[PDB]
Amino acid sequence: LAGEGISVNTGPKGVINDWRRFKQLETEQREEQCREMERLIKKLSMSGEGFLDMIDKEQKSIVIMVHIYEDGTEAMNGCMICLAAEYPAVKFCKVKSSVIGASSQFTRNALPALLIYKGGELIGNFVRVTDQLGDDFFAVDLEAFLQEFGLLPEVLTSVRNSASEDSDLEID
Amino acid sequence: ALHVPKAPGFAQMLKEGAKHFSGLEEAVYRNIQACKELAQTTRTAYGPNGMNKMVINHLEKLFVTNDAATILRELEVQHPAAKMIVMASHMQEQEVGDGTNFVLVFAGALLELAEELLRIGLSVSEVIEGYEIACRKAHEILPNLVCCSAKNLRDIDEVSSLLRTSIMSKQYGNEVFLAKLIAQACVSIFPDSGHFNVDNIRVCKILGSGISSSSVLHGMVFKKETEGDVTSVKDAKIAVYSCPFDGMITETKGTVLIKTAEELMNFSKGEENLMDAQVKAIADTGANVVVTGGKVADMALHYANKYNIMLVRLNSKWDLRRLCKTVGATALPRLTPPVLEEMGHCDSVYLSEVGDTQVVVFKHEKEDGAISTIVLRGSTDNLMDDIERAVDDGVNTFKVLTRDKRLVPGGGATEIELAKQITSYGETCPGLEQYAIKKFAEAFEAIPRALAENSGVKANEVISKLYAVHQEGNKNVGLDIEAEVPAVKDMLEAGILDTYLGKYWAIKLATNAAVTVLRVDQIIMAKPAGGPK
Amino acid sequence: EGPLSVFGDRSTGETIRSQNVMAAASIANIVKSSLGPVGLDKMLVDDIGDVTITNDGATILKLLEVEHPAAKVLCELADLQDKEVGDGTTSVVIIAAELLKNADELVKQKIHPTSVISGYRLACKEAVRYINENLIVNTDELGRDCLINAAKTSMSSKIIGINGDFFANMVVDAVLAIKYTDIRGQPRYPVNSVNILKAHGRSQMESMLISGYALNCVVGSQGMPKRIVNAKIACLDFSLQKTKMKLGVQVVITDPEKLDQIRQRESDITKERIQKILATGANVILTTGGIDDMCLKYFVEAGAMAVRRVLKRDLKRIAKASGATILSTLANLEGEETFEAAMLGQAEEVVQERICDDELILIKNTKARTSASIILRGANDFMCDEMERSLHDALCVVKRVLESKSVVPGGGAVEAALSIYLENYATSMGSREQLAIAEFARSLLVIPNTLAVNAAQDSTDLVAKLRAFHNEAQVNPERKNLKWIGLDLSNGKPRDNKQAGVFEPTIVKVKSLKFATEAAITILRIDDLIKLHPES
Amino acid sequence: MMPTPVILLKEGTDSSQGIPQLVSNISACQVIAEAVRTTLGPRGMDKLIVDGRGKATISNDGATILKLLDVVHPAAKTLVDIAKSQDAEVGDGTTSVTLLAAEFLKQVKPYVEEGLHPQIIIRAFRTATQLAVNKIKEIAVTVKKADKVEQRKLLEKCAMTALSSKLISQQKAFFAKMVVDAVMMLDDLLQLKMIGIKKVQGGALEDSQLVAGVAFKKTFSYAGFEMQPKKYHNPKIALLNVELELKAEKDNAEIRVHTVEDYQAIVDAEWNILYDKLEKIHHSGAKVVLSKLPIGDVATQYFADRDMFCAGRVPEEDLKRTMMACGGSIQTSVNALSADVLGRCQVFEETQIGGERYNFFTGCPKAKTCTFILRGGAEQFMEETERSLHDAIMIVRRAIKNDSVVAGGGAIEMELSKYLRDYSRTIPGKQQLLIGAYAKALEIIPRQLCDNAGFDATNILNKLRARHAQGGTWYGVDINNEDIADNFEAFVWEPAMVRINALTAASEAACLIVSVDETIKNPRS
Numbered sequence A: 001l002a003g004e005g006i007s008v009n010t011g012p013k014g015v016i017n018d019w020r021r022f023k024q025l026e027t028e029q030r031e032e033q034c035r036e037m038e039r040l041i042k043k044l045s046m047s048g049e050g051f052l053d054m055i056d057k058e059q060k061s062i063v064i065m066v067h068i069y070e071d072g073t074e075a076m077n078g079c080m081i082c083l084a085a086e087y088p089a090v091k092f093c094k095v096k097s098s099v100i101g102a103s104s105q106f107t108r109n110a111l112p113a114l115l116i117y118k119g120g121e122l123i124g125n126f127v128r129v130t131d132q133l134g135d136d137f138f139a140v141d142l143e144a145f146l147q148e149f150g151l152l153p154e155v156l157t158s159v160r161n162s163a164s165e166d167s168d169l170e171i172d
Numbered sequence B: 001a002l003h004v005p006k007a008p009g010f011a012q013m014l015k016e017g018a019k020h021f022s023g024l025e026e027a028v029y030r031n032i033q034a035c036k037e038l039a040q041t042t043r044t045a046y047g048p049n050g051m052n053k054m055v056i057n058h059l060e061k062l063f064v065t066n067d068a069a070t071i072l073r074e075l076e077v078q079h080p081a082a083k084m085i086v087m088a089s090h091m092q093e094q095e096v097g098d099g100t101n102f103v104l105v106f107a108g109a110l111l112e113l114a115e116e117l118l119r120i121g122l123s124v125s126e127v128i129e130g131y132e133i134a135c136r137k138a139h140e141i142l143p144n145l146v147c148c149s150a151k152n153l154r155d156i157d158e159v160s161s162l163l164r165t166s167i168m169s170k171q172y173g174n175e176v177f178l179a180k181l182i183a184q185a186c187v188s189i190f191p192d193s194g195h196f197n198v199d200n201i202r203v204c205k206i207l208g209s210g211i212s213s214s215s216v217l218h219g220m221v222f223k224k225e226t227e228g229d230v231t232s233v234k235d236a237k238i239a240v241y242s243c244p245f246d247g248m249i250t251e252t253k254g255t256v257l258i259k260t261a262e263e264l265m266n267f268s269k270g271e272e273n274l275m276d277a278q279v280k281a282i283a284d285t286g287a288n289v290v291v292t293g294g295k296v297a298d299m300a301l302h303y304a305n306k307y308n309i310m311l312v313r314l315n316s317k318w319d320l321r322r323l324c325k326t327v328g329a330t331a332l333p334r335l336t337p338p339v340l341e342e343m344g345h346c347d348s349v350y351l352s353e354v355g356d357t358q359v360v361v362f363k364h365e366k367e368d369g370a371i372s373t374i375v376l377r378g379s380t381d382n383l384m385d386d387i388e389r390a391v392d393d394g395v396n397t398f399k400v401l402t403r404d405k406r407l408v409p410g411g412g413a414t415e416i417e418l419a420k421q422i423t424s425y426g427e428t429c430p431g432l433e434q435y436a437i438k439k440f441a442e443a444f445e446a447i448p449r450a451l452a453e454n455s456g457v458k459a460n461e462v463i464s465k466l467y468a469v470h471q472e473g474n475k476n477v478g479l480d481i482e483a484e485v486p487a488v489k490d491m492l493e494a495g496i497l498d499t500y501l502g503k504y505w506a507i508k509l510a511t512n513a514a515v516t517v518l519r520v521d522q523i524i525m526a527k528p529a530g531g532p533k
Numbered sequence C: 001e002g003p004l005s006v007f008g009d010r011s012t013g014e015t016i017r018s019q020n021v022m023a024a025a026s027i028a029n030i031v032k033s034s035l036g037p038v039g040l041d042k043m044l045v046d047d048i049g050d051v052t053i054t055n056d057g058a059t060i061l062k063l064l065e066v067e068h069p070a071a072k073v074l075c076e077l078a079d080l081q082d083k084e085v086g087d088g089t090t091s092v093v094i095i096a097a098e099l100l101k102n103a104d105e106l107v108k109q110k111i112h113p114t115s116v117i118s119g120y121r122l123a124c125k126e127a128v129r130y131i132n133e134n135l136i137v138n139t140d141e142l143g144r145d146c147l148i149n150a151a152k153t154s155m156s157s158k159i160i161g162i163n164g165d166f167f168a169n170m171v172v173d174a175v176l177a178i179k180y181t182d183i184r185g186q187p188r189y190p191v192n193s194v195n196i197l198k199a200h201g202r203s204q205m206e207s208m209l210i211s212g213y214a215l216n217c218v219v220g221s222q223g224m225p226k227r228i229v230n231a232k233i234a235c236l237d238f239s240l241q242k243t244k245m246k247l248g249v250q251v252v253i254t255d256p257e258k259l260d261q262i263r264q265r266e267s268d269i270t271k272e273r274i275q276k277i278l279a280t281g282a283n284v285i286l287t288t289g290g291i292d293d294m295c296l297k298y299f300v301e302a303g304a305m306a307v308r309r310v311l312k313r314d315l316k317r318i319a320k321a322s323g324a325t326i327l328s329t330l331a332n333l334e335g336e337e338t339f340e341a342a343m344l345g346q347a348e349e350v351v352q353e354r355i356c357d358d359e360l361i362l363i364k365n366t367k368a369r370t371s372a373s374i375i376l377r378g379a380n381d382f383m384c385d386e387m388e389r390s391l392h393d394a395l396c397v398v399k400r401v402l403e404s405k406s407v408v409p410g411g412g413a414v415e416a417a418l419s420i421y422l423e424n425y426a427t428s429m430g431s432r433e434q435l436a437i438a439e440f441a442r443s444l445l446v447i448p449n450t451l452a453v454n455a456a457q458d459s460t461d462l463v464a465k466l467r468a469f470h471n472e473a474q475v476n477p478e479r480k481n482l483k484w485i486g487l488d489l490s491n492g493k494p495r496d497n498k499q500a501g502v503f504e505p506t507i508v509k510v511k512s513l514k515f516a517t518e519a520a521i522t523i524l525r526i527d528d529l530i531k532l533h534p535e536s
Numbered sequence D: 001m002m003p004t005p006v007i008l009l010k011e012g013t014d015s016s017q018g019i020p021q022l023v024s025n026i027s028a029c030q031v032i033a034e035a036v037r038t039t040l041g042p043r044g045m046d047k048l049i050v051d052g053r054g055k056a057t058i059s060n061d062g063a064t065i066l067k068l069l070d071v072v073h074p075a076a077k078t079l080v081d082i083a084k085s086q087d088a089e090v091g092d093g094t095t096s097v098t099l100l101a102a103e104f105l106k107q108v109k110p111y112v113e114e115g116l117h118p119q120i121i122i123r124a125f126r127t128a129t130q131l132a133v134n135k136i137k138e139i140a141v142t143v144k145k146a147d148k149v150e151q152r153k154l155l156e157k158c159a160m161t162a163l164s165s166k167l168i169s170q171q172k173a174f175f176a177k178m179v180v181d182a183v184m185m186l187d188d189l190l191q192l193k194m195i196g197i198k199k200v201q202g203g204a205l206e207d208s209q210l211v212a213g214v215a216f217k218k219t220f221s222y223a224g225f226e227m228q229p230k231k232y233h234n235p236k237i238a239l240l241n242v243e244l245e246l247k248a249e250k251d252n253a254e255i256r257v258h259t260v261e262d263y264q265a266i267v268d269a270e271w272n273i274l275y276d277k278l279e280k281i282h283h284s285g286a287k288v289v290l291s292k293l294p295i296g297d298v299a300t301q302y303f304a305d306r307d308m309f310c311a312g313r314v315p316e317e318d319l320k321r322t323m324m325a326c327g328g329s330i331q332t333s334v335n336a337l338s339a340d341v342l343g344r345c346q347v348f349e350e351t352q353i354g355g356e357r358y359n360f361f362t363g364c365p366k367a368k369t370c371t372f373i374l375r376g377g378a379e380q381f382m383e384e385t386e387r388s389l390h391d392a393i394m395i396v397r398r399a400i401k402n403d404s405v406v407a408g409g410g411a412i413e414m415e416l417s418k419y420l421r422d423y424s425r426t427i428p429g430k431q432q433l434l435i436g437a438y439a440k441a442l443e444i445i446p447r448q449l450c451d452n453a454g455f456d457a458t459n460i461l462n463k464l465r466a467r468h469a470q471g472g473t474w475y476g477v478d479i480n481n482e483d484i485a486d487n488f489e490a491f492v493w494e495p496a497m498v499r500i501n502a503l504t505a506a507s508e509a510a511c512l513i514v515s516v517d518e519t520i521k522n523p524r525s
């Protein structure tokens, strides 16, 4: 048992394919782990790729919130639909916890999750909103509660109007 | 053929977490059982031989006492019927100040006997009607059972003797000393005007020297220090300021606009000169103690030290108001020097330490003043808290005596006489309400029974002796605590007396709670969900 | 962990002593509430819904799951007391635990355990001598009242305590029934020969004492009669079935004409045996083995009762009582198979009695010896089980009283007298063994204290009055009759227990003291414990 | 037990009721008292406790050990509370209170098990404690002539007795004399804040010193500080609460100018303000300048150029002590630096003390304060030394307030036990057993002393009992000679109020523990 100076040398450069494949897979799991860790412990104490690349994409100047649910979820979903009908500029969406594979404590004691993302960072991590909001409050109550913290953003055509750059020229 | 489906109708429409208890057996009997359980938990702390209970609340704070209201407050009661009885007990505590355990025991006995009456065949309406009739009869009887009156409240010995019984149930071993302390403290307050203020009694808990070292102080004691270097004044002329002891500033925004070097060089000097002038003007009125409700500026403190002015900083507005009442000053809103009328006067103000606590004492040599303080010593925080609860009970008893001066015999004598006379009345009453009236009369036995059980003697012998004596004609005879065997003695001679108003209110509230619990027939409980507070 | 390097936990010094004393105190406090007439029974659930209502200390300690080994030591101490005496099972455990507690209290004062052990041994020896010399009453001057009172005292605190006036009489009659003498002329009473049958139904008063033997068995077939007016009992230890050839024998057939004869003989052998048995006039045939259909039919045709699968102990008791002889085989010394009338047991009557929808065999008034059996009736099975346990305790107490003709006053009188005498005597023996003997005397006072506290009475005042009475008896020669003053828990005052009829066998107290002292000495030797971790 | 459809209390509520509850409470009190059993007497040991953070504390003080223990038993916390009470009111005997309370409970446990009503036990404790307190008061030895030398000897002996149980017991005479000298300089209130205690690493215990003035560590000197002289033979000290630095005149101040001449004038005005403050300080005649607020580098260089000493960010307590020693006043404004507000010490010096720099203000003739400089080999060594010095200081303060003493070593305990037993012989008998149990429990102190010292407690206790019976009220345990001796003649003296408070607190704790019959634990929130 000697030769502590192994100096693997040519090994890493000769098997770099498998090492880089494993590194890529581990990093792919790493973005998911970093995204999910922002919710657990950080706020709990006090397909997944679709969610990941939806959070990564879109403009940082648009507030995007997501909801974590398991099968009063129905009332909050109806209120969220009403807010979506009232705030077309926002992109309300929901995703199951089992798809994300969050912790068991979040599944068992944090079923109602109001996660708000603004430019890749958590400006709001409302979790287990049963106590401070209720069970059967309407959409206007949720809108007022969210607007009190300054998070939510502040005619009707017939059906549609939108359709070279030569607009119109009468010049001879 | 292996499952029982829910009945069509209300059972199917019920929420997943809700509960529905309907009918006599499912609701009334369960409520009576819960109330009996609560009475059983609180029963052992009744009377002078009652035992303290160490109750640890949800916040992990230790409470040791035999005060029923405190025990119920610290307990996390969940049954709605027991909740209602606890509300009745708290209402009794707020209205009078003593008799909460009496209310709970009487309500439990009444509900147990109501359950018995329901079982033998009587319906809820007959029981409620009989209980109300018997309560009216007891309220009519009670004035006739008054044995004596206070007849003097400016005395010390009489007040101490009157208050001994109230603070005999709590702190049974040493009640005379506490009675004398509370009597002196209450006599200092309560001037020729008939109005007596309970809040004017202040209790300060200083730890270290045992409760036998407690004393009463005519003034205020604050557990803090003095800002300045002056620590003792012999002819104090306290001036009280609600504003901070500092130069007044604007409300919108104060910007020091400097446009020349002269202003820059002279601004600080002018500010210091203005502060010095203000402090000297304050001191020139003869005021040598200054009490502020806000912060103290460094320059203001320096100039107060230069002119030999004692500075005391009170943080809470309640303490400021109490000190103003005690000394006789007015809380000025600005730093202007006080006029003669607004200037307070005290016999002595000094800094001192008791045990290891630095305190500031506002001491009056005269045996008068609006506010008097009781300095409680002790070897444990919980012991001093229990002594403070006893002091509160004694002060409430004194206030009740001021409101109504009539007293009734204690030691269950009043309860036995009431039971006997209500039983006699119920015999003459025909109809089905006689059973309810007799049960209401028998429910008064729970007080002497609890006293006998706590004292360690057989209850049945005591009850039989009390009935025999009251049939003889002595209506002022209750059980003797200082006896190893069941025995009775005259309470009027022994001075074991409790207030008539307390008994009246306790009986009324207990009867109201019992009948209100009996009136409920169906319970529709929602899902507990959350709601931590 | 450390320099010792052993794969287990270790405890040394006052820690292990405190642990052992705590375990002993836990065992004592488990059963302390079930001592004395004002004691109460206990209800045990066996994790599968089984209920065992009991008051016996041995049963309680045996049914429990015990892990600490000093607690075990007390458990087998109670079991040993039950096996060797039959009574005082709770008292010995309580006394041993109190002795251990006081010995540990002495040890904590830097008194060496050797001195405490020597003092305990000396105190036990002197207590036994004092009991045997001063605190015994000879039963030859009383007769049957002493037996009745001893049985009633044993039955107190049991489910049959109030019915003692009847149960004690039944027990005394049953014990006197089975009395017989052996070599050297000493009369010995073989308890456990009184068969006890439990059957719910009627009240306790309908419990009956059979002047014979009772079998928990029924007749083999419904055709045979269920009552014989003059029983000729023949006891057999072999089954009566078709004869099967042994393992070392085979039947090989080369001539077909022999198979039918072989098959016929295969049952004709048993038929001939049964005919030989029946030709002597036997009416009742009891066998430990089974009986098949053909033999049952033969007995039915003969008009004789036949019972199969009889328990061996029951068969032995029946043979002893009725004068029958157990015959494991029908083979004399002449090489033949014969049955003689000399082996026929005789009983006055055998009846297939019916008891609460079940039936059992009653063998009434056996000759050449008298035997007894008791059938207990109760509300349910738990009540009957408790009745059986209390009945066994009473039978053992009566056995001890009849064997050794000395009794002691009950109700803690012996304990108080011993405490006073040992406290006075300790001043003349050694220096630290003085303290040891004083602690022994003080520990002997736990029994009257428990008796008084179980009645919700003033234990301190009652024990003080008892001690004053015993001290006055000891210091005043003319007041020597106060030794019998014990405790009356009904009224909570001292009472002359010998006059009141509260008696206990002397052997109970002597064995309890000896066993408790030895157990306390054994536990006190420990000063260090190594608890090796299990290999799994 | 049956499941009610709706339960009464909250789910998970635990309730213990009856005699088993009180027995468990007594056992818990015994367990707590066992944690400080071996830290009693001159042969007592120390306990090491490691908190969750990994920091370790080493102490012989019972109150400190109990506080560092995370006691959660409701009945056991009373022992910690009474230990804190004894520490607060007296400062010594924090182990005796716990031992006495636990011994009372252990003595009455057998009577509790027998079903005796606890009110009788409480009454017996109250009666016995009142009698014992009266006996202590009327047998305590006091001298009604108050000579300076005799009072000095009494205080020194009391400090020696209080100190002869810690790691500084070998130098107990030196530290006792230092404590007495320190205490006598306090004027009338004997504030503990007027006795500074500085701990400096490195050095023997005998190297610790008491300064007749003030001393504090050097506080973040700026540039140019090393050029200032570090010794003055009659300095005048300017005690100030002033920030001597270039800074904005006020936080909300704003300067508005529209001319370069005004810009230069503003800069020169700021410089002139600072230099005016510095000149006002300098012209006062002071040579040493101290301030709570920071002193800038410009001011440091200015004072260096004038051969002056400066020190900024001096703590409030250090300046208060310096004012009480030199005799000046802390000035928030330098506009009136009259000669009557300047401190004056004989010698000021900065010296190297064990790898640290300290400023010494010695030679103050009318100083009302002092500073302890404790040396040691470790931080916990210094902390335990400070705790022992605090105990001695509290004892000396109490003796100054009331100079009544009783011989220690268990002599007073044995005398009280004998008196209480003799009283118990003359009562009907129900209270007699309880009072005798109280008297026997009073014997815990000498027994614990003998056990810690490795003696045979039984023989020593028998000899003490016989001696007290035949006469001699001041006979206690003599640790050095393996025997008993007259402790009063051996100068084992403690103030009577120490034992009075110990008995009172132990009796109150025992009565409170016994009075409880039932406990309730609400579920965790």
Ligand SMILES: Nc1ncnc2c1ncn2[C@@H]1O[C@H](COP(=O)(O)OP(=O)(O)O)[C@@H](O)[C@H]1O
Binding pocket: B045, B046, B047, B048, B050, B068, B098, B099, B100, B101, B102, B103, B165, B168, B169, B170, B409, B410, B411, B412, B451, B478, B479, B480, B481, B496, B498
């Ligand atoms: N010395 C005494 N002797 C007999 N009874 C007393 C004595 N002191 C008080 N009592 C009785 O105790 C009762 C007070 O019980 P208490 O514990 O105060 O309950 P509550 O606080 O609900 O009034 C009174 O009704 C009185 O009759």
Ligand SMILES: Nc1ncnc2c1ncn2[C@@H]1O[C@H](COP(=O)(O)OP(=O)(O)O)[C@@H](O)[C@H]1O
Binding pocket: C034, C035, C036, C037, C055, C056, C057, C086, C087, C088, C089, C090, C091, C092, C153, C154, C156, C157, C409, C410, C411, C412, C447, C451, C487, C488, C489, C502, C504
């Ligand atoms: N009628 C009685 N009166 C007074 N004491 C009795 C009576 N019967 C029994 N005792 C006493 O009660 C004690 C408890 O006996 P018990 O517990 O029934 O026996 P075991 O310990 O075998 O269960 C015995 O020592 C006996 O002296």
Ligand SMILES: Nc1ncnc2c1ncn2[C@@H]1O[C@H](COP(=O)(O)OP(=O)(O)O)[C@@H](O)[C@H]1O
Binding pocket: D039, D040, D041, D042, D044, D062, D092, D093, D094, D095, D096, D161, D162, D163, D164, D165, D408, D409, D410, D445, D449, D477, D478, D479, D492
């Ligand atoms: N030199 C000594 N000889 C005998 N006993 C002593 C001596 N010094 C102190 N003691 C005893 O040791 C006991 C404990 O004192 P100490 O350990 O200093 O503080 P605490 O009382 O807080 O434990 C005191 O009651 C005292 O009587």
Ligand SMILES: [Mg+2]
Binding pocket: B098, B099, B100, B166, B169
């Ligand atoms: Mg009250």
Ligand SMILES: [Mg+2]
Binding pocket: C087, C088, C089, C154, C393
């Ligand atoms: Mg028995």
Ligand SMILES: [Mg+2]
Binding pocket: D092, D093, D161, D162, D163, D165, D391
């Ligand atoms: Mg000390």
